[PDB]
């Protein structure tokens, strides 16, 4: 139960569907499955062909250049889980160069544990934007999809209605489906670990993705970790053993597995049937247990291995001694560094040389954890034990606090390393102790670390003068030991509301230093009031072919400007909702020019117009229109409105409104905005 | 007459005006004159001090850090000509770091034949824009003027009226003078070579600059070429011999000159008293004649010489054999190449290596005329007989039609040569015969020749469609041996009123070549009618570390619209 079929370890199928019937009954394939290179197949060769029995694949799965096939909903309706122990350039699902493959129907796929999915050169495939990979994968940014039918936008990959979840991702709701029929199932935000059932209840704590009954280890569909006899289990109880991270086997099983290479003979450690023991361990004639002892040499093929992915990496997983040379070349675009670290150099020695060529995203080398010694018994051509070229993101090699390095023979080869400055280079020379080896042009002294000023020399500001429209800085004028080499001063400035982070200045006359009255400076005019700015300065000096005087840069500093008179208080609306109440409302001004303290409010009693007092309204023409000195005032604080009381019925009022960004000394305030209003008659 | 004083050859004066009275009477100083490093001088130390006796200096003249002096019209009112045989970084007049020096008054200076003038760090000097150098010099674009009182625009350097010629040069009439009194004299457009007299009449065909009477060899002021006894002469009549390009001397004079190094012992050849003979020649015990014979090793100091100017060059003038190594380093800014050719390697051999470092304006090496062999017996470190770095204008080395090259040992070193494409580099490897020596990265395969598409491959347009609003070009689709490497098509377009000489296109599908219907095109909309356009295409491909497939460029074509 939970798995009615068998194991049937992975065999890959070619050229016709004849050997496909060898892999019918089995429920979970150990290893991987590849289906490839069937040019003489037909669409009718798949309609009489289905395998619902497969549920989980351990390692990976591949589809490559088979004609006549258009879907996968029939061939594998019920594949659900990919564990991904053995990966494939950090992928586990290969959908590639498949002519006529237009859809998947892979709705039952729920979680892919480790790896990613690459889809390429499949000019019929659609229904792809309807696939939320985050429900199935963790690192969705490692999924390359290109050269497909969706890339020429034609497919209406729709479903009739509600069912399929239309979830917002980037711009709007994305309807999630697999076919026009099959929606993409979404478990709720609490059943995410072990999957959910049909109504959405959480499964048992050892289920995964699907369960036949909610909260039942005997009625799951897929185990999260381990399987044992109708129960998904958290661990192997004694005397059982974890085999390939998915099940518990007895002693006799992994015992008799050893007896068949007479190829991967097996041993036991940590209640686990494993291939081999690491260093300091020994087999056992009784039970094949990795016993500790006194004193693991992974001798390469031809002493050499190009290393480019996890597929390369797991071949040297757990090794301690490398009897060969290593080549690091990853044309990448994605940091694999943690997974790179996870199966790498728990070693000290490399018998031959080390090569690092044209890798892109490798920012560091700290994943070499215990790496100490370079023997270099076989050197790189040009007499090198070390190589380095074309590493666009490499900045740090190691912290030389506790990391060490011993290099027996060979030399260093540093070229085209634009984020690798010479400081840690010479530190590596020092800690290597091999400084008396390197000739000229063993280090490219024009390309290595030429994107940021690095090394040592720091500028220090002597004086700061600020204004609302002026900036002056004063700092110590540094001079290199040849004072003629100073060409000028590179200055970078910008504004910065955060703190999470261009002009040039001629050098002055040096001419002495009892009183070198040459403290250099620059005036900025382009200032905004109340505004935070971020400024730093670099020294422009002449390059020399020798050990050049490294030149200085300044600290990034933050200076807010002062504050001027605020702008016009926008839209004064003066409504009189009562006979003595006038609401005046307004918008903030366009330029507050500082933190606004308050709003200066003036209301002025405008008398009636004086020409009306000497007119004869008893004559026809009686058309009446239904309409320093201290004025009454208000400092409206933290409000964009003000109702005014104690007002006359039938009296027009002038209103002068200003804002004020300064209140306590000598009020800096806005310019006058005007309106006029009239109270209601009683 | 014409020169009543004497020669008094060049000695340079330091630390006080005491030794200056050694050089009083003399008419034309052979060699050079430098006056330097006098801090404790006063302006009163010059009003009782004048030398009108000097008219011409042969080689050069230098003024360096002497205080209290403000002018020069008193010390040398009548210096007139600088010939300029021995130069000083292609200058013959050095005015440098002179505190209080505010004007010149050097009105009698008329022609400077060879060399230039450099002015620097003289924060008192003015009257500078009033000096037409074209009247006095030829290559006026080799004159360096900076760090002066003129550089902070204050001096009104005017004259009271007419006198001084106000000549349009660049923007308007430029008044030409030396002081507020001394105008700059301009001879007419017919008396230009030999100079003019006061009223403007032409001087004699052997005069130069000034003449006491117009058209009189016996009443010149300065000779054009040669002097003999009150007459400026075109050459030496017998039995006389040319000495230092300015006079005629007898056999007795240059004879007795030889008898004094017992340092420049002299011989005679081609009716000339000269220092030495070139290769294949022999002296004479009777008359010191460069007689031809069968079979000039300019053995250097420590086998090494940095070469930077003509002053470095004339030390190796006319050499044939170099027992040493040469360093070519000219942070220049001006092409010296003709005069560089004028006194250089009529040679075939170099015993040591050759170095070329950071030279800027050297577009070619054709001034190397006869060079064939490098022995390389002392190498550049790193086992090189040859060196090349940082040459921002170097494109051609030589024409390998007739130029040859023989290399014994050593290697090649090519870096940062941004207009030096690899084709002629491999041709140099071939004609050298030392192709089986160069390792990896002896040639910078990224920086050498990366400013213009060079190598081989030419695009050819199959079809042309024009309009007044549409342009379509179709060409033969080139495909490299890895068709994946083609990433796009770089196109450069612009209009062209003369013929004296930007968009991208994606690559189409290769997929076959019985019928590769992939003749690629671009439609242009931005057309003006009746307008001539200049269009050409480059192929954008993938770099590889190996011998990369060089990529194609098209021809600059001209298309006139409707």
């Amino acid at each position: 139960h939970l798995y009615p079929g068998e194991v049937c370890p992975g065999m890959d199928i070619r050229n016709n569907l004849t050997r496909l019937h060898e892999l019918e009954n089995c429920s979970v394939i150990e290893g991987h499955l590849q289906i490839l290179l069937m040019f003489k197949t037909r669409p009718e060769d798949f309609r009489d062909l289905s395998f619902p029995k497969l549920i989980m694949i351990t390692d990976y799965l591949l589809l490559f250049r088979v004609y006549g096939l258009e879907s996968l909903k029939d061939l594998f309706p019920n594949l659900t889980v990919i564990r991904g122990s053995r990966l494939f350039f950090n992928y586990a699902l290969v959908i590639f160069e498949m002519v006529h493959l237009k859809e998947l129907g892979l709705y039952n796929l729920m979680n892919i544990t480790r790896g990613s999915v690459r889809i390429e050169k499949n000019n019929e495939l659609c229904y792809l934007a309807t696939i939320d990979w985050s429900r199935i994968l963790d690192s969705v940014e490692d999924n390359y999809i290109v050269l497909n039918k969706d890339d020429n936008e034609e497919c209406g990959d729709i479903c009739p209605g509600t069912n399929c979840p239309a979830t917002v991702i980037n711009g709007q709701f994305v309807e999630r489906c697999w076919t026009h029929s099959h929606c993409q199932k979404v478990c709720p935000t609490i059943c995410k670990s072990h999957g959910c059932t049909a109504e959405g209840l959480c499964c048992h704590s050892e289920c995964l993705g699907n369960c036949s009954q909610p909260d039942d280890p005997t009625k799951c569909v897929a185990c999260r970790n381990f399987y044992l006899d109708g129960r998904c289990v958290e661990t192997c109880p004694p005397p059982y053993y974890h085999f390939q991270d998915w099940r518990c086997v007895n002693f006799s099983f992994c015992q008799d597995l050893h007896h068949k290479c007479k190829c991967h003979q097996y041993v036991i450690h940590n209640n686990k049937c494993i291939p081999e023991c690491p260093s300091g361990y020994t087999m056992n004639s009784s039970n094949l247990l990795c016993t500790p002892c006194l004193g693991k040499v992974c001798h390469l093929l031809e002493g050499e291995k190009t290393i480019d992915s996890v597929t390369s990496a797991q071949e040297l997983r757990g090794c301690t001694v490398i009897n060969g040379s290593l080549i690091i070349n990853i044309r990448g675009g994605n940091n694999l560094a943690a997974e790179l670290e996870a199966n790498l150099g728990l070693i000290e020695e490399i018998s031959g040389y080390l090569k690092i060529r044209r890798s892109y995203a490798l920012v560091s080398l700290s994943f070499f954890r215990k790496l100490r010694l370079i023997r270099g018994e076989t050197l790189e051509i040009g007499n090198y034990s070390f190589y380095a070229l074309d590493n666009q993101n490499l900045r740090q090699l190691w912290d030389w606090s506790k990391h060490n390095l011993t290099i027996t023979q060979g030399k260093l080869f540093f070229h085209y390393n634009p984020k690798l400055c010479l400081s840690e280079i010479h530190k590596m020379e020092e800690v290597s102790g091999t400084k008396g080896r390197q000739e000229r042009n063993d280090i490219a002294l024009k390309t290595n670390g030429d994107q940021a000023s690095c090394e040592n020399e720091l500028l220090k500001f002597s004086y700061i003068r600020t204004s609302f429209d002026k900036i002056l800085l004063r700092w110590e004028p540094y001079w290199p030991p040849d004072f003629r080499d100073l060409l000028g001063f590179m200055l970078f400035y910008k504004e910065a509301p955060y703190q999470n982070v261009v002009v040039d200045i001629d050098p002055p006359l040096r001419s002495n230093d009892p009183k070198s009255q040459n403290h250099p400076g620059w005036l900025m005019r382009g200032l905004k009031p109340w505004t935070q700015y971020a400024i730093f300065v670099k020294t422009l000096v002449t390059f020399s072919d020798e050990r050049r005087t490294y030149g200085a840069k300044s600290d990034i500093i933050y200076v807010q400007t002062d504050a001027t008179n605020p702008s016009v208080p926008l839209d004064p609306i003066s409504v009189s909702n009562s006979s003595s109440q006038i609401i005046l409302k307004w918008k903030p001004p366009s330029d507050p020019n500082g933190n606004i303290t308050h709003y200066l409010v003036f209301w002025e009693r405008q008398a009636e117009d004086s020409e009306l007092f000497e007119l004869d309204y008893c004559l026809k023409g009686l058309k009446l229109p239904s309409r320093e000195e201290h004025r009454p005032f208000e400092k409206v604080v933290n409000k964009e409105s003000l109702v005014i009381s104690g007002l006359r019925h039938f009296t027009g009022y002038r209103i002068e409104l200003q804002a004020c960004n300064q209140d306590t000394p000598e009020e800096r305030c806005s310019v006058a905005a005007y309106v006029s209003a009239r109270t209601m008659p009683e | 007459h014409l020169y009543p004083g004497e020669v008094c050859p060049g000695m340079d004066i330091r630390n006080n005006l005491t030794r200056l009275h050694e050089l009083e009477n003399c008419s034309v100083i052979e060699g050079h004159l430098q006056i330097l490093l006098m801090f404790k001088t006063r302006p009163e130390d010059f009003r009782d001090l004048s030398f009108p006796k000097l008219i011409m200096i042969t080689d050069y003249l230098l003024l360096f850090r002497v205080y209290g002096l403000e002018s020069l019209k008193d010390l040398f009112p009548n210096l007139t000509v600088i010939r300029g045989s021995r130069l000083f970084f292609n200058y013959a007049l050095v005015i440098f770091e002179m505190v209080h020096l505010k004007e010149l008054g050097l009105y009698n200076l008329m022609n400077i034949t060879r060399g230039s003038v450099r002015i620097e760090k003289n924060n008192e000097l003015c009257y500078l824009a009033t000096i037409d150098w074209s009247r006095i010099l030829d290559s006026v674009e080799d004159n360096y003027i900076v760090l002066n009182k003129d550089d902070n625009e204050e001096c009104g350097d005017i004259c009271p009226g007419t006198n001084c010629p106000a000549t349009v040069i660049n923007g308007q009439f430029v008044e030409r003078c030396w002081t507020h009194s001394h105008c700059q004299k301009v001879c007419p457009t017919i008396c230009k070579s030999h100079g003019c007299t006061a009223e403007g009449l032409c001087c004699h065909s052997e005069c130069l600059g000034n003449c006491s009477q117009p058209d009189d060899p016996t009443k010149c002021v300065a000779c054009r070429n040669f002097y003999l006894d009150g007459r400026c002469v075109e050459t030496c009549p017998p039995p006389y011999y040319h000495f230092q390009d300015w006079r005629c001397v007898n056999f007795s004079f240059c004879q007795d000159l030889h008898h004094k190094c017992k340092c420049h012992q002299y011989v005679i050849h081609n009716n000339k008293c000269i220092p030495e003979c070139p290769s294949g020649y022999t002296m004479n015990s009777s008359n010191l004649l460069c007689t031809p014979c069968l079979g000039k090793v300019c053995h250097l100091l420590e086998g090494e010489k940095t070469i930077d100017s003509v002053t470095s060059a004339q030390e190796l003038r006319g050499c044939t054999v170099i027992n040493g190594s040469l360093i070519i380093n000219i942070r220049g800014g001006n092409n010296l190449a003709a005069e560089l050719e004028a006194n250089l390697g009529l040679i075939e051999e170099i015993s040591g290596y050759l170095k070329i470092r950071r030279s800027y304006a050297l577009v070619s090496l054709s001034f190397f005329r006869k060079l064939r062999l490098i022995r390389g017996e002392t190498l550049e470190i790193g086992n090189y007989s040859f060196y090349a770095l940082d040459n921002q204008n170097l494109r051609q080395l030589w024409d390998w039609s007739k130029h040859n090259l023989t290399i014994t040992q050593g290697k090649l070193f090519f870096h940062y040569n941004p207009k030096l494409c690899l084709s002629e580099i491999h041709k140099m490897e071939e004609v050298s015969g030392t192709k089986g020596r160069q390792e990896r990265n002896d040639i910078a395969l990224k920086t050498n020749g990366d400013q213009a598409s060079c190598e081989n491959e030419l695009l050819k347009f199959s079809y042309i469609r024009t309009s007044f609003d549409k342009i379509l070009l179709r060409w033969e689709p080139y495909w490299p041996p890895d068709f994946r490497d083609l990433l796009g098509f770089m196109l450069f377009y612009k209009e062209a009123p003369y013929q004296n000489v930007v968009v991208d296109i994606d690559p189409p599908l290769r997929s076959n070549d019985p019928k590769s219907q992939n003749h690629p095109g671009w439609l242009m909309r931005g057309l003006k009618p009746w307008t001539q356009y200049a269009i050409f295409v480059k192929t954008l491909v993938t770099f590889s570390d190996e011998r990369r497939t060089y990529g194609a460029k098209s021809d600059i074509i001209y298309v006139q619209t409707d």
Binding site: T542 | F89, E120, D308, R331, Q392
Partner: peptide, 30 residues
């Protein structure tokens, strides 16, 4: 772009150097 000015300043420096090299050793002869 303006790197000719950059090498021009070094040219100025070389011109500074050479005059100083002329001034330097006429004196030590011992």
């Amino acid at each position: 772009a303006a790197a000719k000015e950059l090498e021009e300043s070094s040219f100025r420096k070389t011109f500074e150097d050479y005059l100083h090299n002329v001034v330097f050793v006429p004196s030590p002869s011992r």
